Swiss-Prot record:
Induction: Up-regulated by pathogens, methyljasmonate, salicylic acid, salt, osmotic stress, cold, auxin, cytokinin and abscisic acid treatments. Not induced by desiccation and ethylene treatment. Coiled coil: none annotated. 3'-phosphoadenylyl sulfate binds at residues 70-75, 157, 165, 216. The gene is SOT12. Sulfotransferase that utilizes 3'-phospho-5'-adenylyl sulfate (PAPS) as sulfonate donor to catalyze the stereospecific sulfate conjugation of 24-epibrassinosteroids. Preferred substrates are 24-epicathasterone and 6-deoxo-24-epicathasterone. Low activity with 22-deoxy-24-epiteasterone. No activity with 24-epimers catasterone and brassinolide. Sulfonates salicylic acid. May be involved in detoxification. Enhances plant response to pathogen infection and contributes to long distance signaling in systemic acquired resistance (SAR). The active site is at 135 (proton acceptor). Dimer. This is Cytosolic sulfotransferase 12.
């Protein structure tokens, strides 16, 4: 087997030998996954990472949201966009708010996705401060991102939700028991899951002005508190509790427990405990 021919021919020729040389495994969501810098990727995402690493030029004023593959990000993208833009596009003029005019996925673009499909897209023609989204590993971010003083928010979902998102996506398009086993081994799309998470967890403790670690579970349960925490990481000034409440209210128009049998949930929990000892990130 050889890789597919996807996208811009010129970029295909620039990346195809590299991709053809990497380790590959049977894909579930896809024909083959490929190991690149420690993580397994679909061909499309890998082409977009390779181009992104070569072409993206970070700015110190950038904010990058890092999320896991196939989780919903509409709500998070909206909250952070609305917070950052709360004077440029006041939360109150509601009907005229970009979140209402346009889709949050166009406002807060998925980097690797854009590079896959539109390799010449000029990110510098977007307004600063640029809010953007990625799933790229902390260790695989473009060198300009690593060297900048931009801000990175890692939004961590429970690994069981990370799996179920991938599962629900693929089954939409090989039994669940086998997919759980592969996910737990790490040889699975976007995996190993523990490395994706731990690299940002470590960065959030070692370089807390560069990386902030947010659990989706806390963003859901205590949204006002978590948003004030994000604001304080992103910006220097004071933010009123009411400004945060109005942001949450604007964004209010935008789990594994129902899908996983208990034996699969426990299987993932066994890998979580093993891999996260004593990190100490613990999950609820």
């Amino acid at each position: 087997s050889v890789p597919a021919y996807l996208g811009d021919e010129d970029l295909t020729q620039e990346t195809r030998a590299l991709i053809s040389s990497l380790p590959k495994e049977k894909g579930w969501l896809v024909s083959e996954i490929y190991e690149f810098q420690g993580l397994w990727h679909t061909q499309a995402i890998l082409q977009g990472i390779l181009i992104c690493q070569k072409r993206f030029e970070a700015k110190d004023s950038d904010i990058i949201l890092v999320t896991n593959p196939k989780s919903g990000t509409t709500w998070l993208k909206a909250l952070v966009f609305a917070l950052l833009n709360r004077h440029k596009f006041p939360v109150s003029s509601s009907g005229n708010h970009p979140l209402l005019v346009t889709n949050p996925h166009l406002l807060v673009p998925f980097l690797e996705g854009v590079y896959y499909e539109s390799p010449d897209f000029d990110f510098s023609s977007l307004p600063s401060p640029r809010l953007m989204n990625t799933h790229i590993s902390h260790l695989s971010l473009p060198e300009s991102v690593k060297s900048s003083s931009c801000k990175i928010v890692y939004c961590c979902r429970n690994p069981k939700d990370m799996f179920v998102s991938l599962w629900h996506f693929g089954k939409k398009l090989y039994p669940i028991e086998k997919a759980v086993e592969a996910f737990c081994e790490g040889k699975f799309i976007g995996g190993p899951f523990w490395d994706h998470i731990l690299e940002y967890w470590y960065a959030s403790r070692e370089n807390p002005n560069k990386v902030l670690f947010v659990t989706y579970e806390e963003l859901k349960k205590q949204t006002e508190v978590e948003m004030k925490r994000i604001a304080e990481f992103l910006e220097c000034g004071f933010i009123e509790e009411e400004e945060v409440r109005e942001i949450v209210k604007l964004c209010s128009f935008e789990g594994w427990r129902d899908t996983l049998s208990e034996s699969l949930a426990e299987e993932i929990d066994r890998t979580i405990e093993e891999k996260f000892k004593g990190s100490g990130l613990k999950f609820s």
